[PDB]
Hints:
Layout: E1 2-9, E2 15-16, E3 20-24, E4 35-37, E5 52-53, E6 61-63, H1 65-69, H2 82-93, E7 99-103, E8 108-110, E9 115-116, E10 128-132, E11 149-151, H3 152-163, E12 174-177, H4 184-187, H5 198-215, E13 220-226, H6 229-234, H7 241-244, H8 251-266, E14 273-278, E15 283-284, E16 287-288, H9 298-306, H10 321-325, H11 332-343, E17 348-354, H12 362-377, E18 382-385, H13 392-402, E19 414-420, E20 426-433, E21 436-446, E22 453-460, E23 468-474, E24 477-486, E25 493-498, E26 502-508
Parallel strand pairs: 1-22, 3-18, 4-7, 7-12, 10-11, 12-13, 13-14, 14-17, 17-18
Antiparallel strand pairs: 1-19, 2-19, 5-6, 6-9, 8-10, 15-16, 19-20, 20-21, 21-26, 22-25, 23-24, 23-26
Helix pairs in contact: 3-5, 5-8, 8-11, 9-12, 12-13
Zinc ion binds at residues 29, 389, 392, 395.
Binding site for Zn(2+): 29, 389, 395
Family: Belongs to the glycosyl hydrolase 9 (cellulase E) family.
Protein name: Endoglucanase J
Amino acid sequence: AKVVDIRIDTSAERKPISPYIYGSNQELDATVTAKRFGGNRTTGYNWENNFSNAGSDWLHYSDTYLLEDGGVPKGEWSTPASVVTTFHDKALSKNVPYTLITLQAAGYVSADGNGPVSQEETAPSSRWKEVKFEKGAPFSLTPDTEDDYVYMDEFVNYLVNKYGNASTPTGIKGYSIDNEPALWSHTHPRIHPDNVTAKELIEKSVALSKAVKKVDPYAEIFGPALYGFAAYETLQSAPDWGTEGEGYRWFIDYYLDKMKKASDEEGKRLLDVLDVHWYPEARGGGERICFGADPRNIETNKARLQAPRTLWDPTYIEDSWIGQWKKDFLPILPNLLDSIEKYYPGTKLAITEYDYGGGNHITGGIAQADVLGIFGKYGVYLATFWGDASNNYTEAGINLYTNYDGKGGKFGDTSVKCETSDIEVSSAYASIVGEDDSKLHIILLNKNYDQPTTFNFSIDSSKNYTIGNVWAFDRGSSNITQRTPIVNIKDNTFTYTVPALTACHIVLE
Ligand SMILES: OC[C@H]1O[C@@H](O[C@H]2[C@H](O)[C@@H](O)[C@H](O[C@H]3[C@H](O)[C@@H](O)[C@H](O[C@H]4[C@H](O)[C@H](O)[C@H](O)O[C@@H]4CO)O[C@@H]3CO)O[C@@H]2CO)[C@H](O)[C@@H](O)[C@@H]1O
Ligand SMILES: [Ca+2]
Ligand SMILES: [Cl-]
Ligand SMILES: [Zn+2]
C-alpha cells in the first residue's frame, strides 16, 4: 500500500496564477485561455495578401496554406490580414482573453502564392517583398501590394484600427518577434540563408518593438521564440557569439541584458515577455518522449510522467543530452527566471510551444496536467501547447484546469502552498479564487503506474471544509467525469485513495 501525505496551507505562499498559461497554437477540443498565431508558416506571412511560405517543411512553397488551414472564408482571401483577423475573431468568439500574433522579422515575406521558390529565387527576388518595420509615411488600411515592401507598423495599425489597442477588451494583447530565429537559415533558407547573428537579432528586436509600440503602446512584445536549449545557450552557435557572448553565461542573459539596455536608452520597456519553445528532450525506453514516441513503450510512458520535473525540481536529472551535459542550467524554469531577475527584472516568461507527447495516452494527459500546475505555481505568464485535436488526453489535461465540469468550472487563479511527501509518485497543486479561500481547488495526480495511491490530506485554512466534489480522467476515458464526493473531512483532514494513473480536480467547500 503506497501512502502519501499532502499538506496545504491556504494562507501561505499566495501568488497569482496567470490566466494565460492554458493556451494553444492549434484549434483544440479544449477550453483554452490564449491563442498564438505562430510557428514556421508565420515567418514569411504577408499580411497584405495572406500568402506565406512553407520553408523546409514543404519544398519552400509560397501559397494559400494559412488561408485554407485557418478556415478563412474564400471571399476574404484577398482582404488584408484576413488570416489574422479570422484567427482573432475565432479566439474572441471562444471567449479567449489573450491573442498573440507573430510579426515578421527574418526579412522578407511571400510576394505571391505561385508555388515552390527556387534557390535561385532566394530573397531578394520577384518572389519576395522586403519587410520594413516602420513605414515612415502615413499608414493605409488598403496597403499597396504593388510596391516592394511590407510594413510591420502598418500591419499593427490595421489590427488596432479594427479591434482597439491592447488595453481594450477586444484588442490583440501581444506580438511575437517572428519565430525561432536561430533556425531561420535551416527552416527558411530562401528568406534568410545566413545563420542569424546575435547582433542582428537584437537590432531587429529593438527596431520592431519600437515600431509596434509607437502604434500600440499597450501591446506586449514577446521574444525571441527560441526553438530549444541550444538556441537558449548560444543562439545555435551564432557566428558572432564568441565576441558578443563574452561575459555571459548563455544567450538568454545576453538577450535580456541588451533588450534592457535598449529599453533604458529608449525610455520604455521594449521586451515584455521572454519567449521560448520547450520540447522535452527526456528519453525513456530508448526514445524521446515526444516526436514519434510509441505509446506502447511503458518505459517511455514512465519517463513522460517524470519529465515535467526538469522544469522545476533540482533533484531530478532526466535522460537526455541536456540532463547529462547542461546540469548548470537545470531546473530550467528557475534558471530562466533567475536570468530575468539578474538582467531584466519585471520581464515575464512564456513557453509558446511545447509538447510532452503521448497526447492520446493517459500519461500525456497526466504530464500535461502536471506541466500546467508547474507553470501556474512557478509564475509562467503565458503558454501555448503545440499539437492538434487528436491529442485527446492532452486536451483533458487542459480542461481539467479550464473547464472541468463542462460548464466553465475552472481551477482557482491564486496558487497556495501545497506539498506532497512523494514527488515521484504524485503531484498536487492547490489554488483559491482571488483572496478568498471559501472554495479550495486541488489538482491531484497519481503517477503510480499499476497500483492505487492513498493520500492523507491535512489542510490549514480559515474555513472548515465539509465536502470535496471530484472530477477526473483516467485510462477508461479522456472525458472528464464527476466522481463520488469526498465527505468525511475531520478538522480539515481526510484520506482519499486514487487509482493508478488518474488525474483529479477536487473542489472543497
Ligand atoms: O501547400 C503545400 C501543401 O501543404 C501541406 O501542408 C503542410 C504545410 O504546407 C506546411 O507548411 C506545414 O508545416 C508545419 C510543419 O509540418 C510542422 O512540423 C511545424 O512544426 C513546428 C513549428 O514550426 C515550431 O516553431 C517548432 O519547430 O516546433 C513545431 C513542431 O513540433 O509547423 C509547420 C507550419 O508552421 O505542414 C503542413 C502539413 O504537412 C498540405 O497538406 C498539402 O495539401 C499542400 O499541398
Ligand atoms: Ca506593399
Ligand atoms: Cl531559435
Ligand atoms: Zn481532441
